Scaffold this motif. Sequence first.
Motif, PDB file in Angstrom:
ATOM      1  N   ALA A 168       0.838  -1.206   0.000  1.00 40.71           N
ATOM      2  CA  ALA A 168       0.000   0.000   0.000  1.00 40.71           C
ATOM      3  C   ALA A 168       0.876   1.260   0.000  1.00 40.71           C
ATOM      4  N   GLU A 209       3.160   6.852  -7.331  1.00 43.79           N
ATOM      5  CA  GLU A 209       2.198   7.911  -7.648  1.00 43.79           C
ATOM      6  C   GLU A 209       2.729   9.301  -7.251  1.00 43.79           C
ATOM      7  N   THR A 243       0.808  12.668  -1.522  1.00 38.60           N
ATOM      8  CA  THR A 243       0.697  12.923  -0.088  1.00 38.60           C
ATOM      9  C   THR A 243       1.601  11.927   0.699  1.00 38.60           C
ATOM     10  N   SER A 244       2.798  12.415   1.079  1.00 37.80           N
ATOM     11  CA  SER A 244       3.836  11.664   1.791  1.00 37.80           C
ATOM     12  C   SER A 244       3.433  11.181   3.202  1.00 37.80           C
ATOM     13  N   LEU A 245       2.363  11.763   3.787  1.00 37.60           N
ATOM     14  CA  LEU A 245       1.857  11.422   5.119  1.00 37.60           C
ATOM     15  C   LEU A 245       1.336   9.986   5.196  1.00 37.60           C
ATOM     16  N   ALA A 246       0.408   9.609   4.293  1.00 34.71           N
ATOM     17  CA  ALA A 246      -0.208   8.277   4.239  1.00 34.71           C
ATOM     18  C   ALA A 246       0.802   7.132   4.109  1.00 34.71           C
ATOM     19  N   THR A 300       2.727   1.550  -3.609  1.00 37.25           N
ATOM     20  CA  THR A 300       1.860   2.068  -4.676  1.00 37.25           C
ATOM     21  C   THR A 300       1.818   3.600  -4.590  1.00 37.25           C
ATOM     22  N   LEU A 301       1.837   4.142  -3.355  1.00 39.56           N
ATOM     23  CA  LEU A 301       1.842   5.579  -3.077  1.00 39.56           C
ATOM     24  C   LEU A 301       3.180   6.227  -3.445  1.00 39.56           C
TER      25      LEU A 301
END
Lengths: 355, 330
Positions: free
Chosen positions: A286, A293, A294-297, A289-290
């Motif tokens: 998860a 692609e 918001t560095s927080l999540a 994948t980020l």
Amino acid sequence: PKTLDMGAILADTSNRVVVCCGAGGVGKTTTAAALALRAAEYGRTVVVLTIDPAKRLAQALGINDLGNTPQRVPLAPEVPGELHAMMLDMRRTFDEMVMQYSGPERAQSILDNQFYQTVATSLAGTQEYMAMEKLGQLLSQDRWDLIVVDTPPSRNALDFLDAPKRLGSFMDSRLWRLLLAITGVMGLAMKALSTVLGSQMLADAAAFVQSLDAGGFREKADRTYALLKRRGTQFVVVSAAEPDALREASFFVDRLSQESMPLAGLVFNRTHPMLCALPIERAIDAAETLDAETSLAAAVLRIHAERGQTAKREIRLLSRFTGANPTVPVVGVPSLPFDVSDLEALRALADQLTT
Amino acid sequence: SVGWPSRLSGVRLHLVTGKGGTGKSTIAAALALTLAAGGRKVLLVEVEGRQGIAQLFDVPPLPYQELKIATAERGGQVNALAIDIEAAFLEYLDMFYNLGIAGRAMRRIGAVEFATTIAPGLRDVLLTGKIKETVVRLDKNKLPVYDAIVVDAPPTGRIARFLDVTKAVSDLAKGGPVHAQSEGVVKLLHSNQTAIHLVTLLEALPVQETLEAIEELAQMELPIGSVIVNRNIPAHLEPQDLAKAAEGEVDADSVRAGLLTAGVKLPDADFAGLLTETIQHATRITARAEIAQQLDALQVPRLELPTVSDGVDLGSLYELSESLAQQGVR
Ligand SMILES: Nc1ncnc2c1ncn2[C@@H]1O[C@H](COP(=O)(O)OP(=O)(O)O)[C@@H](O)[C@H]1O
Ligand SMILES: Nc1ncnc2c1ncn2[C@@H]1O[C@H](COP(=O)(O)OP(=O)(O)O)[C@@H](O)[C@H]1O
Ligand SMILES: [Ca+2]
Ligand SMILES: [Ca+2]
Ligand SMILES: [Mg+2]
Ligand SMILES: [Mg+2]
């Protein structure tokens, strides 16, 4: 497994002495203090013999002074029992021992001896020997229904049980009188020491042997060790979720078993229980994948996955101890998000220990 | 800003101190590996009779001999010396007083163990004296046998006294050859040929002891090398996001949105739990940064090593050596 019930052990007044053992840096002092504060909250008249509390914890207990004697820890008026605490003064306990057996007159000479002050009081095993001596002094005065004993830090958890006797046998060596206070072998050794060591140092060492005038030290360590064999004694082994600390805990558990000494159980301190059920494989993917692609999540996912990996190591370490020791009751204590250095933090630690 | 100024490359004697359990033994071995790389020969020395080198390399107890224990990068070599204080005392009696006979008789009645135990100054004279002998030793061509000596030294609470040659010699017999050799030991320790490195953890007590040791050592005019911050952990959060999370503020709306993007929908008990996990991490980082700030006052180079995820094995020593090399250690 099997769950350790510290609350029921503390509330039962047939338990008179609670000894907190293990390697250093695992939470022995804070566990000892949290247990003692709890017993007091249960209505017991308790004394905690701490070794090395961190400055802020020692101040919270009102034991930051040079004293070598228990003092009353003032608590909320609702508290039905009494908490008393002290920090061991190793050198002062040696003075007390010297005076108890030599008398106050002869003690003035021994206490003033430079060899005593700089060498005899700092020998290996003095911290364990003096902890045992102080425990002995606390028991003889009968001023408390419960004594919680903290034990000196060491890489070796068994030093608490072995170092006083080891120091005692060294102190009773034939070599002190023979080489400081004639023969072929002893004469050769005496000549060698005279040739290498300072005349002043040798005079202070021989004066110390003459002045002290003691198998005295081993016999003292033996009688004091027998106090740990009295009915109403409970040993608590403390370990961090680390392999070295657990191996030391296991060595200690084996010894207690061989010696038929009652073991309450293991405090598996500084754990990281999972607050989120999301699997580790899913969390990394998860976050990955980020990343493409918001560095927080993604960072939040990386915290959780890292904690999950930490939690996995802790579970397999504990399952190794539990497999080898299936009879040993255990309590897992999570790493608290604050320092255990005030009465309120001790209360929160005691809540973890007694659930 | 550099963790290893150039002057430290000229140092022949490296002393690795720090509080117990901070990583002195591990880091002294990783430092030895780093300095031996490129066909160099480094000696790794331990002085407390604890057999920490043998334990680290998972081998039986080492005898009182310099023995090859590890091959460094590109033909380098690390030798090990576990100093045996009893054998060092007999060596001293025989070489300086010709009492090899008296010495051998003392060993058979446990009198060497006694003498070394009852005289801590004699112990430190024997140990620092042997360390000096390994440093100044020359080969057939008047060249140093070792390129560097790395000492897995006594902890922060004992290091200043261990290097106090004047105090150690004060309780020894007046005259003879020992008082002449002690001058050379003092000269070596106080020179640019020596550096004392201090291992610390980002924990209150290891940092306090590091500060207290640096002050005691500076007063003695003993050369400080680097502060080595061991077992660092990843922050995972940007400075602003971390500062907020340490107070209990992690915006969930942004977290819930980024989770939906990755195809993850969590229930209320798991989402709340995931948030407190990051708050607790951020609380741990903030506290560690507050402890680390106390070192900022020292105008001393600082090195950082990561946490080896599992137990420290032979491969872990090479990863830590590689981490030191990347920071300019040479
Ligand atoms: N469960 C815990 N959660 C958080 N901090 C803890 C916990 N137990 C102990 N600590 C902290 O760990 C450090 C070491 O604890 P201490 O009791 O002095 O250990 P020991 O006597 O075993 O060396 C202290 O700073 C203490 O506040
Ligand atoms: N970077 C590291 N990551 C993980 N574990 C480490 C690291 N450095 C040291 N350790 C471990 O920490 C413990 C204490 O380290 P050690 O070198 O024996 O310290 P010291 O000699 O100062 O007592 C050992 O179990 C060791 O394997
Ligand atoms: Ca009551
Ligand atoms: Ca004993
Ligand atoms: Mg302690
Ligand atoms: Mg070590």
